[PDB]
Design a protein around this motif. Structure first.
Motif, PDB file in Angstrom:
ATOM      1  N   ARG A 185      -1.349   2.856   1.381  1.00  0.00           N
ATOM      2  CA  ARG A 185      -0.826   3.857   2.492  1.00  0.00           C
ATOM      3  C   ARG A 185      -0.669   5.152   2.010  1.00  0.00           C
ATOM      4  O   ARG A 185      -1.025   5.993   3.002  1.00  0.00           O
ATOM      5  CB  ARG A 185       0.628   3.046   2.642  1.00  0.00           C
TER       6      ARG A 185
ATOM      7  N   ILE B 293      -6.434   3.197   6.414  1.00  0.00           N
ATOM      8  CA  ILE B 293      -5.758   3.494   5.030  1.00  0.00           C
ATOM      9  C   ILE B 293      -6.488   3.066   3.932  1.00  0.00           C
ATOM     10  O   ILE B 293      -5.743   2.687   3.010  1.00  0.00           O
ATOM     11  CB  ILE B 293      -4.247   3.026   5.289  1.00  0.00           C
TER      12      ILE B 293
ATOM     13  N   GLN C 260       3.136   7.335   3.779  1.00  0.00           N
ATOM     14  CA  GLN C 260       2.433   8.708   4.022  1.00  0.00           C
ATOM     15  C   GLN C 260       3.611   9.907   3.933  1.00  0.00           C
ATOM     16  O   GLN C 260       3.103  11.065   3.832  1.00  0.00           O
ATOM     17  CB  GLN C 260       1.949   8.535   5.475  1.00  0.00           C
TER      18      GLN C 260
END
Ligand SMILES: Nc1nc2c(ncn2[C@@H]2O[C@H](COP(=O)(O)OP(=O)(O)OP(O)(O)=S)[C@@H](O)[C@H]2O)c(=O)[nH]1
Ligand SMILES: Nc1nc2c(ncn2[C@@H]2O[C@H](COP(=O)(O)OP(=O)(O)OP(O)(O)=S)[C@@H](O)[C@H]2O)c(=O)[nH]1
Ligand SMILES: Nc1nc2c(ncn2[C@@H]2O[C@H](COP(=O)(O)OP(=O)(O)OP(O)(O)=S)[C@@H](O)[C@H]2O)c(=O)[nH]1
Ligand SMILES: Nc1nc2c(ncn2[C@@H]2O[C@H](COP(=O)(O)OP(=O)(O)OP(O)(O)=S)[C@@H](O)[C@H]2O)c(=O)[nH]1
Ligand SMILES: [Mg+2]
Ligand SMILES: [Mg+2]
Ligand SMILES: [Mg+2]
Ligand SMILES: [Mg+2]
Lengths: 392, 390, 391, 392
Positions: free
Chosen positions: D168, D224, D57
């Motif tokens: 992710r 995600i 992230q």
């Protein structure tokens, strides 16, 4: 009715130290802040006795107290000096003027007046004499740090800093480690006299007890009372509510003739009487119109979402009342209740009527789920006053 | 004078107007035709300037900000560059003081400031420094002028800001949110000269500037909700008028901006349009009005179809391209996957087959759901599916 | 064939900027790339057209204009404002349009000097960048002194074909362009707008050559062009997933378009061997995509439909097996994550539990009386009998 | 190894161009992506032929293909330059390595070799040669504009980019330009050669057909997961189900002696014989244990939260099975059903049992409002196998 709010501001100034004139918009809480400072300090222009500052989200610490700026030095020698902002300049100017008329600070009083000329200098400071400004400031805070707290409980020139729209700017960014200084207990002369150093330039700083922070603040955007936790404890709050007493014929004649008191004020009287003869026979029409719409606002939404008395304060004829109503307050009332026609009709209290000289005519169509939405109608002439008469 | 009777009478009353209204309505057009017909400037420049707001438009590039400026070989001298607004506000003030002579001594000095404000090139450091001195001379001169000689300035300047609800309207008008009012202009009843943060210069709005905003109020969460912004600006609701979509009104509009020879071909094309619409000269008026009523009653009053979609039609095929590629993807964007409403907006609530824009799929879902599909029509069958709306 | 080609060509003269919106898997970028190539005869991007695509980091400062450090001297890094991708096109489309005019724009030495500094691929040296910034100030002093009749008809059509216009924050990327993207607000229109840019301060206006054909997907509804003031500017062409291309003859016409009769004989017998295993029917993949797109319209929405880019590149029945279990059934499972009685209905196997079903039923049950199915990888002719039951 | 999960990756990656190996944790997804690329490129480490990066992230679009990254020069410390990310340093590397065996670059074969040196250069680019790098980059996209599509279909190397945990990062933002390039007929040489224009550097960019992207997303988490429908068309999802068939007696000897080809094959075999002889001489015990948990998790939880076959793959003894149970998968099972005790007792098939040889003993103390919760029991010895034989 203006001296009753001057006595309320002056009571909560010497008690707390600083004041927030919070109120719904259309109130004179900037004009009350501006006229009280002009009446008390006897300075019509914003300079050398007070200063006007407007806050916003782009307003930062470097231009409010002090930051770094380049100057017009030598050509290959551009220098970064610490140019003071407005709050440091007004608190130094209140301290310099306070020590100029002090008796025990007579060690260097011929130099404190030199520092006063540098602070009322209405231009960027020259680089050949900026070190004279730097050395006089370093001489000053050395002298105030060697003075007791007896002779600093009060200073007779009372300076002001009218901060407009204080809830717009982020108050934590521009008051970095200096929001604690605003209290009367922590000023330069309280028992907790706190001379904090500044993070740039190494200069000490502490606000004098005569500098007052008269803030004006809207409270209809989102703020009610809990939006300003960094200043809700330091600042004394005064509700400047919309007074509809200023919409009577006797009051509206007196307000507009306060400034324009020349021969054309007689032309206003034959114009204002022409307005209050078309509103029926009464002089209390604009007052009852504002009162019977402000009650119908504070019963639905909030108290501080109220229509102020500055919209209707500049009407002279029925045409100007037509321009205030259809372009400034009814497009403001439609954005209070965006697409909720059962209560925006009720603020104008025409809930039984669907058409026939109503501001919101009903469309003849229904809805699939049962929705019914109205439509704005422009009125003009005696039909508009017949639609304003049914509000009161 | 059909819509300048509101705009020109609200600028002398309040100082600035926001023409708010649903899109497809002449908000930019009225705000452009009014400024052009008054200042007699077909292009921006001297007497007016067009800008617009967006999310990446900030305070430093609007009124006053910092800016690096290396010219050819010098070091990066961080000059303070005035934004769009101060190059209109100082330009309105200097052109204001250039016409009168009461105490404005140095008319060549004021003219020297006006040349250094309309510079297309960026200012040299030998010319910027004298521009900074003459701007300090300007506010020392205005601070010693009476209010009787500053209440009227003949060159009415104009700063037209389209899409005024896009940018952060409290961050943009930073030191300007308590200066734009008519009482606090430079010559009003309370002449307020505030001090700007970066350059440190005093700055007040001269009484020439009329800020002609045109807010789009289609979508919420970006409209002017803050009531302090709703008080300086006297709004004007510009309703989408379908009266510009009759035969005699649409022919009068498109002939106004056309030549003499092509006006006969334009009139022949509009006779051919309404002859294919069933000799109904009130057709596109009642088409837009009976679809704006359905959008008003269901969604809200500010998502209505404007009269700029159907204004540029010239044949039945041009109405077909407006109806399937400009307002039907618009109607399917309002009521996304909500089919029982969009059939009712076109009042095809009972019609499920035949001449209808949305046929019904023959099978329903597993738990009582049913969706439609956009049927493409053509010719007189399309008009038969359009004349049943009205 | 040429219907979607002509429909783009009509709306790019009426509204000015077309948008090909549709479910993902149809010919949106393809009909946009084939339109600009067939209209400009330029197969690679360059002067006549430029392909870009939007994203969330495609901000305003690099699309129209912004500050960009550039010195070209390995010293004295000059913090100057550089034009983005759009303003390098709209200034190029203007000064290319100012060639064919006879005597209105008298700049025939100064316009061509500006065009050769706009198409220059090598970055601008500061001794010639001061010439480029001075000639651009001449351009907006020139434009404004021209009549609208000699400015509406600029000959060479420029295209900024953009892609995924919904994916970027479109109201932020379009800055001053949010009021200039009408056909009558350009140069030469009835109401021209010489609007002013924030950073450089030089004025700007789009020429009437530049058309913005921008393709988007509308299955993500999280990012769809719901601004109602950027649907007035654009003309929205519906590009539905058309299963007409997945016939036997229509697949043979598309896939044998560029093969020069070398592998076309291999492709002809390969499609002859595919449809001989599907049941000797030329109309299998047409009604397979039709009975899924209809069954996904009544459940999810109109916009999450399966396109025809999945099944268009099948050659044998093995390649249909590897595009079913690996591209569309993982796509169908993530529409309906742990929603099992719905995804069983899209394949209309709702009464079918065991046997030749894609989702066999687990023999276990739940403690609270629940159940869940398990994906069954089928192979051979039993896969087709599990697929023909959808139709 | 080459039977299913290798021959269906290589066939599908050569057809679609990009493969995502979606599956629950504990399955060979990172492993089959690592084994396929190393067995193809014959390079057991990253670098020249392939690059193994992973998403998160904090991963930037500016650090993936192109962004402004401030570098540290000598005399000007703050110098903002545009630096190509890892994908533009593998897409340009896959292009100029494949363009060594072409016949239209006959003017600049030395310039392509010089550009390949600057991309393989692991040293940071000095600004004296960065302009040499940018002059060769804009020469490259001039050269592929004059290259025919018949000669860009076959580039003889095969470059790979194994991105790991693709789901992710913000995959719509990281693949900024790559949401319209990543297709087999939209790379270079395909039926629609698309050379898009990058924002920052202003240089055109197009993914070569030399490149391949093997993502390995995880699908246990759902916030995600990759629901971008316009992006799921670009990839080709391969479900790697957690196969319990890798936990039989013959399969554990074949998976653990293939990698460890040392002389400890006699040591592993006598230990794996002793482990299954303590399990009742059941050669299909651990196959049945993982199968009767993954089915019982599929029916109550989602189908993508199943126990993988990487927990029970590294078991050697009953003491090692006791360590992988009470410390890896039983805290995992208490995470799936967090204080849902009637479910987690049922997953282990101990629903009626509340005392004795059981993992979760019942507390003998009920609550105020009728609630009741259980307690773990650390078992050992043959009583532990008696608590595992109840599951199968
Ligand atoms: N004479 C007189 N004028 C008043 C009075 N109250 C308001 N006004 C007039 O109305 C105008 C509006 O008051 P003002 O103080 O400017 O509102 P504001 O506080 O700035 O409104 P906002 O910024 O919070 S939105 C002023 O220009 C002032 O002239 C009053 O009590 N007496
Ligand atoms: N002659 C004439 N043309 C009009 C009128 N109203 C709109 N138009 C035409 O419609 C077009 C679009 O109107 P415009 O003013 O640009 O909408 P807008 O307010 O900018 O729309 P938005 O920016 O809020 S989305 C204009 O080019 C104008 O020519 C009108 O009243 N008279
Ligand atoms: N010949 C032909 N090919 C088509 C047609 N429609 C789609 N294709 C092929 O399918 C492939 C994918 O289509 P494409 O345009 O890339 O989908 P897309 O709309 O761009 O996908 P998206 O993620 O941006 S939403 C293209 O390579 C194109 O060749 C068609 O109508 N005719
Ligand atoms: N020999 C062999 N080992 C396998 C196989 N499947 C899994 N493994 C083993 O599993 C271990 C880890 O599996 P791995 O692929 O890394 O899980 P993962 O995909 O990373 O799980 P995640 O957290 O990203 S979701 C490796 O040590 C590998 O040896 C297989 O089929 N054969
Ligand atoms: Mg105020
Ligand atoms: Mg507009
Ligand atoms: Mg695309
Ligand atoms: Mg992994």
């Amino acid at each position: 009715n203006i001296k009753e709010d001057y006595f309320r501001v002056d009571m909560l100034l010497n008690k707390k130290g600083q004041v927030i004139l919070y109120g719904p918009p259309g109130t004179g809480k900037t004009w009350i802040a501006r006229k009280y400072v002009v009446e008390e300090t006897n300075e019509k222009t914003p300079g050398n006795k007070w200063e006007f500052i407007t806050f916003h989200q782009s307003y930062s610490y470097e231009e409010f107290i002090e930051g770094f700026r380049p100057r017009t030095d030598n050509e290959e020698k551009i220098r970064y000096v610490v140019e003071d902002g407005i709050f440091k300049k007004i608190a130094l100017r209140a301290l310099v003027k306070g020590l100029f008329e002090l008796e025990d600070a007579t060690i260097g009083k011929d130099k404190i007046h030199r520092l006063y000329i540098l602070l009322t200098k209405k231009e960027p400071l020259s680089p050949t004499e900026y070190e004279e400004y730097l050395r006089l400031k370093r001489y000053l805070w050395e002298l105030v740090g060697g003075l007791p707290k007896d002779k600093l409980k009060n200073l007779t020139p009372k300076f002001y800093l009218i901060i407009d729209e204080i809830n717009r700017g982020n108050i934590s960014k521009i008051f970095g480690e200096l929001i604690t200084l605003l209290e009367k207990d922590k000023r330069l002369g309280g028992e907790n006299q706190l001379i904090v150093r500044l993070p740039y330039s190494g200069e000490p700083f502490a606000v004098p007890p005569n500098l007052y922070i008269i803030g004006t603040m809207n409270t209809a955007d989102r703020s009610i009372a809990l939006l300003d936790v960094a200043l809700r404890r330091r600042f004394a709050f005064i509700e400047v509510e919309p007074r509809p007493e200023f919409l009577e014929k006797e009051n509206l004649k007196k307000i507009r003739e306060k400034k324009l008191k020349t021969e054309d004020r007689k032309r206003l009287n034959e114009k204002l009487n022409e307005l209050f003869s078309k509103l029926g026979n009464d002089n209390y029409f604009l007052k009852t119109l504002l009162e019977k719409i402000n009650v119908r606002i504070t019963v639905v939404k909030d108290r501080d979402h109220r229509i102020g008395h500055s919209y209707f304060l500049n009407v002279e004829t029925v045409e100007d009342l037509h321009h205030v109503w259809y372009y400034e307050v009814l497009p403001l009332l439609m954005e209070y209740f965006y697409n909720d026609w059962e209560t925006i009709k009720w603020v104008l209290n025409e809930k039984g009527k669907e058409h026939g000289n109503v501001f919101f005519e009903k469309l003849r169509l229904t809805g699939p789920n049962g929705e019914e939405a109205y439509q704005l109608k422009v009125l003009e002439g005696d039909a508009f006053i017949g639609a304003l008469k049914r509000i009161i």
